[PDB]
Nucleic acid binder design. Structure first.
Length: 16
RNA sequence: GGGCGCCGGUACGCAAGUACGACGGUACGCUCC
């Protein structure tokens, strides 16, 4: 499995 | 191009990491023309 991330899949990121 | 996974680079760091909707994708692994 690849490295563990935090900021999600772009689609989610609404309000800056 | 976009999705899902994820990442760059931004924090933090000794450098790689681990954070992180800093703010930018979709590269690279699959999927749809």
């Amino acid at each position: 499995m690849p490295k563990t991330r935090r900021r999600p899949r772009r689609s989610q990121r609404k309000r800056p």
